[PDB]
């Protein structure tokens, strides 16, 4: 069902275009919010103190408030004060304007995670929506009517997958101990290595995704898996998302680079720089025992519907 949220993050042209591309967003419009009076337009904007805001009406059963917020935080500057790009001034201040107080704990929990990650307080303000004044028609869907129009942000990021770690919390150590096979546990929690060619996904090349077996967190697309004789499944890059891998220096007689999952800090394997030069040149040599393959046709039912259509290159 429907829901809405008002977001301020710099020139609303770019921001509106960006959200019009997000799956779950039903409709958008731009306007002026929380100024010092309930009257304005472009010409009076600097005098009234409103913030250029984007109205986002979305189907909360397809995309969540939390998710719209994560999308919002990936494309705006959260530290910038009264500025985003070249546009400077109070009408460009960042803000999250809400209407239902019951939405606050979700809003602030995203703000706190965002700050713990940045290490400092963010300049984004969050307050109750006082009034929203639709902007003139030439401003609505501006970037649609005027491609090659001013746009600081890359509206493209709108189409990159969003994996919310909060959906893949790491179970207690004892639950993993009880839930994994002795091997997956040894490999995943003690950094062991499964045997070379007898592993389950070495020769697997079916459509779908590869998930962290300890948390369920999506890790690799089938499209990035390639033929290798090394013995272990090999990918050219983590699931269209760099944030998903932790890199650690490793010595076991040699000098390598180990890779672990983001959410569960599971030992996955190692990454080498001898992969196909066309796919990027890297080889994420991954243990099968640290993964669960979810076939394209089982994804929806497995809770991974949102990762379709990222399966095709």
């Amino acid at each position: 069902h429907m829901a809405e949220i008002y977001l301020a993050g710099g020139c609303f042209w770019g921001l509106e275009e960006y959200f019009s591309r997000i799956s779950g967003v039903l409709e958008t419009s731009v306007g002026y919010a929380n100024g010092q009076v309930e009257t304005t337009n472009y010409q009076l904007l600097k005098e009234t103190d409103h913030a250029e805001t984007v109205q986002v009406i979305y189907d909360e059963k397809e995309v969540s408030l939390r998710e719209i917020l994560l999308y919002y935080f990936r494309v705006i500057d959260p530290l910038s004060i009264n500025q985003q790009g070249n546009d400077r001034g109070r009408q460009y201040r960042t803000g999250i304007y809400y209407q239902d107080e019951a939405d606050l704990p979700a809003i602030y929990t995203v703000v706190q995670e965002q700050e713990r990650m940045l290490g400092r307080k963010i300049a984004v303000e969050v307050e109750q929506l006082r009034h929203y004044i639709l902007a003139e028609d030439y401003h609505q869907d501006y970037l649609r009517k005027n491609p090659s129009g001013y746009c600081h942000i890359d509206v493209t990021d709108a189409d990159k997958p969003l994996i919310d770690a909060a959906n893949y919390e790491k179970p207690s150590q004892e639950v993993l101990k009880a839930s994994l096979s002795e091997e997956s546990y040894r490999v995943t929690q003690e950094a062991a290595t499964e045997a070379p060619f007898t592993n389950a996904y070495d020769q697997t090349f079916e459509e779908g995704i590869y998930v962290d077996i300890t948390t369920g967190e999506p890790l690799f697309f089938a499209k990035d898996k390639f033929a290798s004789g090394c013995g272990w499944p090999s990918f050219s890059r983590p699931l269209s998302k760099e944030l998903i891998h932790y890199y650690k220096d490793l010595s076991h007689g040699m000098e390598r680079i180990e890779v672990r999952s983001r959410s569960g800090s599971a030992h996955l394997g190692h990454v080498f720089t001898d992969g196909p030069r066309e796919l990027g040149g890297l080889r994420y040599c991954i243990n099968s025992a640290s993964l669960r393959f979810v076939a394209k046709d089982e994804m929806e039912k497995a809770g991974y519907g949102y990762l379709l259509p990222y399966l095709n290159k």
Partner: peptide
């Protein structure tokens, strides 16, 4: 053996 190990990955290399």
């Amino acid at each position: 053996s190990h990955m290399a």
